[PDB]
Amino acid sequence: VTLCSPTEDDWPGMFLLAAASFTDFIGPESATAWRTLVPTDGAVVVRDSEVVGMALYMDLRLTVPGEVVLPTAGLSFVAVAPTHRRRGLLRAMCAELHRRIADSGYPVAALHASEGGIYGRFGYGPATTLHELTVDRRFARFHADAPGGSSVRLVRPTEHRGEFEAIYERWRQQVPGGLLRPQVLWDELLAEAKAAPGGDRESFALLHPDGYALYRVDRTDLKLARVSELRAVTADAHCALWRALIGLDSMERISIITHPQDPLPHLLTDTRLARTTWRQDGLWLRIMNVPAALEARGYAHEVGEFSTVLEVSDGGRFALKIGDGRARCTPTDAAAEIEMDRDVLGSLYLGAHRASTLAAANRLRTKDSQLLRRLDAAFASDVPVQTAFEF
Amino acid sequence: VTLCSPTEDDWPGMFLLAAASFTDFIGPESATAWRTLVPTDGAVVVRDSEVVGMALYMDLRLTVPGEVVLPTAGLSFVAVAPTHRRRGLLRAMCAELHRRIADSGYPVAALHASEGGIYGRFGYGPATTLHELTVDRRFARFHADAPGGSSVRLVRPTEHRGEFEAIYERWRQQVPGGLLRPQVLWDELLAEAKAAPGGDRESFALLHPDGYALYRVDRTDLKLARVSELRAVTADAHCALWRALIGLDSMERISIITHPQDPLPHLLTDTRLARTTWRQDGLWLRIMNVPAALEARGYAHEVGEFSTVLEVSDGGRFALKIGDGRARCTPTDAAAEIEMDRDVLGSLYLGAHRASTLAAANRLRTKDSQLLRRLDAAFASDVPVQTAFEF
Amino acid sequence: VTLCSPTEDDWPGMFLLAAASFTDFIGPESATAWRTLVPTDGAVVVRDSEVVGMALYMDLRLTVPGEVVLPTAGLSFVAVAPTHRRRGLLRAMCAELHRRIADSGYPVAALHASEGGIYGRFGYGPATTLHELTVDRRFARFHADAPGGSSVRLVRPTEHRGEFEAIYERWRQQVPGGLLRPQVLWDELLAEAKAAPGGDRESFALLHPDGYALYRVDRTDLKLARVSELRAVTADAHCALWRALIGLDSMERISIITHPQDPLPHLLTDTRLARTTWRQDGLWLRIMNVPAALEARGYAHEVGEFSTVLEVSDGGRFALKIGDGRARCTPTDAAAEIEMDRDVLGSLYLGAHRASTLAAANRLRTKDSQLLRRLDAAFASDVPVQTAFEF
Amino acid sequence: VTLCSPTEDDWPGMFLLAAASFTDFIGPESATAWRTLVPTDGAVVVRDSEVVGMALYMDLRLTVPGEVVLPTAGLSFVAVAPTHRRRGLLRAMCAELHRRIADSGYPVAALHASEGGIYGRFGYGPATTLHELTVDRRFARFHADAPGGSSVRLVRPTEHRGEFEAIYERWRQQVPGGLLRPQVLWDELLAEAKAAPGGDRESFALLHPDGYALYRVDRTDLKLARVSELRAVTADAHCALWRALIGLDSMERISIITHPQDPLPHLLTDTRLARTTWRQDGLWLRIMNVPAALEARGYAHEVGEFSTVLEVSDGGRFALKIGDGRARCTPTDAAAEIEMDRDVLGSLYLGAHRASTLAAANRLRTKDSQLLRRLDAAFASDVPVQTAFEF
Amino acid sequence: VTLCSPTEDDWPGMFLLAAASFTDFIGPESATAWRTLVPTDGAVVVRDSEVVGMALYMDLRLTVPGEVVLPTAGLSFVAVAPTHRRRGLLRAMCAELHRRIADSGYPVAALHASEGGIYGRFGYGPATTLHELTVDRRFARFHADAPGGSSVRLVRPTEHRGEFEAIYERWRQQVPGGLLRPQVLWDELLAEAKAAPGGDRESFALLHPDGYALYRVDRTDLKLARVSELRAVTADAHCALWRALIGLDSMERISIITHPQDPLPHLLTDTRLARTTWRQDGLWLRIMNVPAALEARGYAHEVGEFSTVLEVSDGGRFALKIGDGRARCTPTDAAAEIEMDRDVLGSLYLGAHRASTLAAANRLRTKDSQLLRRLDAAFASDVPVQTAFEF
């Protein structure tokens, strides 16, 4: 077996492995569109003749707390042939891509995990949380304080692409976890909005000046509407879109994959009607360069200036000073006051997990509880961390 | 219909209404034990001859952030006869008890809600969050950093009451949401630990010096262990108890009703194995006296001294100054900078809900986003808010 | 918002609202075929630019007891945008169409209800009952008295359209609830008989000289045959068709949506094998002109001549004389002996509901129990009321 | 009604009856391919004008113990119209085909039964056993003794037809129950390997020099892989293919329809992981000529030479001498020592059922238990009996 | 931790561990009855004070092919505390008991496995197969050849103990897998025949001179009868009991845990009605003394005298000569012709698994296929191997 960047001849072998590895495999036409986001030298294959392993990264733009946009390597299309398990192919492919990603100057890498047990050992920590809410809309009544209660319009998605793009572009710059969505991914999204024979039903859009929702009736449960995407840049837009969705009088239930701080439950007289039916890790982060990443993000202005020494396991030791919402992170050989594996740092980085929660599991070690409270407060995000789209 | 404090003659009528209203009705013997927590004048009934409505409160001790214990009126045993719906009996009973509770000098009242849509209009806000985790323990592997890995012992609950009481007493003083558990409730708890013919199976305990877990196999799902209660006063105890529970090799799944900040997922190599299968409002709070409650709790030392004017709808207007983890809350007629209904204040009070989340739903109105960030940070609890026991 | 008859430009907006409102939306091609049954001025839309509401009626021919055929306005394609709920659009559209229907000279209007709680307040009463029977055909044995036991032929529906049309035309003239089925609806029916990729399986027909049955295997339950339509003009045809359906030896169960008086159960040695698995209101009637409707239908010859005074709430007061199977219904200011809302009259009109049953619910008020027995007997239909097809 | 060989004009009527009788009806194009295996005079129809009944046989080659290949008449496409049940059409069609099959010189006939209760009375006995194994591959660990542990390759079925054909041809000559698979059935098999809109997903192949496996993800259960076919000519190939299938890391379960003696369970440390989820009769045999069939197959060399008298009910009486793995079977009027119906002989013939098991049900009568042990041992197959493909 | 034989003081600790380890724990009274089958020094415990591990064996009598009864050590009541997993307690307890069992002169040990993956590494091989048949008795029709068709009587189990004991005693001496059932186990069995509040329903018996069946209606499925035990010493008794069970006209289905060679399916016109709904390893055997065990059992008289050299991994090497249904097994240092682990020998020993099946998984290695056929034939049992009762 040998690991190398793939030639044009390798791509049919990669699509076969893809088709056999991913049940949601988007097919060669869609794969060729996503491929435009893969830089030169962004892919590796392992051949035995035939492709027995592959992995690549895409050039992405990730919003982190403080409305800072980082260049991000988005790992994807990772597969090992069922014939070549337990031969260290994944470890070999991840090592080679991480080397290329670091040499290319990316401060962070990111992925969506097919399983929860794989990516921790390669330095990836879960950094966003997916939260499915299911609303029994037959009982849903909006609170007297709820904004609104004719600003929203029912429209065909393909006829209002420009308006969706503009709303999304405002949303992603404003929200930690936001990703730039390139033209090819808008092409792919609005192609999925069409009904398929023996497949998904037709998608409809609810369009507001400052938000949109894309939804479709479930294939088999004809009383369930699934919201594929709701992007709202104001509270008024968010409420107005939910009033319109609760107006889907032929539906019994409306489902959406959102974030833990979604205010929908508080818009209703009965907060319990917005049931949490599913929770899962969303985006995973590997901090490639600790000082670059720590200095790039904004921090909470509320916590007072403090200094400490952070040691990342096989990742370096730093004098970390945080004050006025900014961090300075410099090399030191001074005694560490905080230790953690690289994956734990990825989990803290966007504000989704509390340092004190990770400390309680001993994933993060300090002998100073005041330092723990200060890390918690400083790494907290004012804007709740959200998940943009799966890649 | 007339509302009055119940005579000894009313109690058989109250037990009949109880039996018809609560499917989990604990029966007259248990009810008579709980009754010892109801003060003189703690109960109201509405008669038509027969009891058509009832409500009472118990004297409770609630731990709030800063390890401060408040006297708390715990509303319970609230029922209206199916024959007397929509005659304002609940509104009449809640008004009379709230008057008695306020005149008695309780700064807060609390309850567990049978439905989510009832108690908001009487000034109760959900203040704790129940989070059910289900672990597929056949795949569960503890992380290398996980504490431990013979400190825990498998024991009969009834033989180690004193040790459970001592651990719980340490736990409840330390944790916001903690309740003092009186002797009668320990009597009731250890009586539920026995197997019942056609009922629950036998309960077992896992006992550590600094924690315990009570669990039983599910009646019908014989591969499910349900943890009724896990109290751990150290991280070492929490991990050691979970190592023992993952050691229940005849079980496929272990379930527990915990809090959102439970560190269990981070103790495992695969965080996804600890699945969130259910979420619900736990304890509801009504702030009876805004200045007494706001001044009693501790606040985050991290946020800098700040002053504002809080107006509670039909609850008064206050100059609120927070600094050095303490609040001063005094009458003012100065212009309000923050407005909210009383229920919203109950929801912020223990740190379970963010002011900025409630603002996004317009349940909390200010024109200052800096003030919002300061409220969020100040009302945050360093110790995660937990739910003690249902009443 | 404005209500007006739709221009050709409005129809794409109407199809979008249709697609978003009706999960069974037949698509623009089918909708354009049904549209040929909508008279000039038969449709209304409410615009905000975009279509936020619509409703129309079709010209139909309804058979009522006595084999009398009434011109009937069939309301259909009624939708309000999820963005424009609770603004009285439905009430405004129903008022305008009812005005047009009454001015056009229709004695009755009719509809199929998407929900049971909407149409009562606009004067529509449920007038037919759908009764689903499921037969476990593996145990089905025909009684010795059962007619028959090679008159039926298994055929391709598209090759015997003329024979189906002729049988249906005889059936609909003979049966209360019968509707004339125009050529476009035969086009649509025999187009649904074809298998669809990821859709329904192929339909087969059982053809007798005096009856037919159309059936198909269920998409997902491959041991269930669903009879979409069985029309039999003689008892011999009905039995012969059921012998052939019980002969579907690869099926475990045969299902059909029929009427409560279907004799199938009595054709078998075990009447219990024909299980009632579902019941629902079928056709709803609004009597537009009380005297025209009451005088048009035939009445039971068995009841002796009787006279009374019927008052319809906001519908007039009439001297009603019934004798020799005919009614005379004339204006009066004499004291009412019977009162009911207009919807109740629609429910009595085809013989599906007993006056004494509606009296027991106080939907129909009289102080004379003899009058009640006479109404029951007179309004009864000798031919059981059936449902023709959904519109 | 009349029974006759079908003209070219009869075939559209036969396809209509097929479509109405077989939910898995392969359609006219596929039926026309299978039709190439039906000899002249291989089919009968019963007409009333229209086709109310049909049955045919195909020319097949069946491997029986001793690696002997018999010409075999494969009955198929048997249907009676639901309109013509209980008129003896099946009995009339089976009698006519059996006459033709016997006159043509076939020693055995065979079929796959749509139900278990039909074919016994026409002399067919179930002769192979289908055994579905479902493996929870997440727990599957191969035993230290298991062969292997990169010989298998993941490939597209349509690109390796020649290799599949060659492996199958070696397999079918070696295994009792093996059938020659003609070119048209390879055409049909590799056409089913393609994904269908609203139908089955894409098939993949695992290819070894001495075995192959064809599998696809289940349409609705996306964590289930179904192996449609695994053919292995060596133990090494069988183990290597199962290592590759257990490597389908995105699947929770792998299912296969195999035979009772499949060694898969013994390849794993936990034999229980290979769960038997389904069992059913596979191939049914009717021995057309008792002496020809008994003399054609090989017998166990282990049992010593023995002689007996076998009487088949309405099938003749024979002096049966078995020695050195060969039988001689000659006419006799000597007293019978063994009696059985013809169907019982079909059940013994390939070694799937023990004579002593059928004796215990009195399907096989002797007064000599030594004779029973000798029949059991002699009729046993060294190579386990398997099922080739459904027809 | 220390391993030692338990004192009377240890038994409450053992019952606590039992209650926490076995959901079907029979309780202290039943455990005390089973305890009478445990010899002096038959039990081991591991203490830390408290019991963290236990294992014992009972003195049993096992019937093996040739109607030979072996003294057998029945391992049971094996548990490790959930607090003491992965400390080698099981390995330590099994080593100590195996030493005692071997020194005591038992030629074999046996157990029922709670999981399939544990006992192979301690030399236990699965030796019997449990086969659940479920009959849809509404379609069940007995074949014309079926024996019988008033010999069976419906009776109360507790009134016919003597008759059950006598039938069972005849059965167990005759059948490989048979166990002597001592008086205490008859006490326990007929105590389980009584209905329990919130537990199993009442058991009934069907009694024949040469067989009995004990059955009860399922707790929750009231159309399912479960046969707990059917013992028949003649084919006539077996058929007569099944005629009576198919006569349970209020039941839809009859279920029984039987063996793979149960003739029930062949008693019916439709063999498919007896569905295999479950299969699992029953009794596991560890051959403690290879020569004693191999020489004790009878072998098939059909296979000719043959000699070979068997090597058991860490179990010795033997010259094995089999002829006239007897084996001689003597020490040798001659080259091995057959090798296998000890567990594989346990799996062959009662005739449930074929040597050629285990060879195909490479659990059994030889370079002689003739030797394999001879082992298969010789180790085969004329009487099908059955499972007596769980211990």
Ligand SMILES: N=C(N)N/N=C/c1ccc(Cl)cc1
């Ligand atoms: N569609 C997704 N959820 N991820 N797809 C990512 C992808 C990236 C690169 C290639 Cl070449 C193909 C696919």
Ligand SMILES: N=C(N)N/N=C/c1ccc(Cl)cc1
């Ligand atoms: N057992 C509970 N979950 N709540 N029970 C509270 C209660 C309080 C007072 C009386 Cl008199 C009876 C019951």
Ligand SMILES: N=C(N)N/N=C/c1ccc(Cl)cc1
């Ligand atoms: N197919 C139905 N069940 N009802 N469809 C009625 C309809 C009537 C008019 C138009 Cl323009 C479109 C559809």
Ligand SMILES: N=C(N)N/N=C/c1ccc(Cl)cc1
């Ligand atoms: N595809 C099958 N499982 N059996 N199909 C057999 C067949 C045989 C002859 C004709 Cl003409 C059509 C079909």
Ligand SMILES: N=C(N)N/N=C/c1ccc(Cl)cc1
């Ligand atoms: N009831 C069973 N299935 N096995 N029980 C075996 C047992 C053996 C010894 C003791 Cl001390 C307790 C129980």
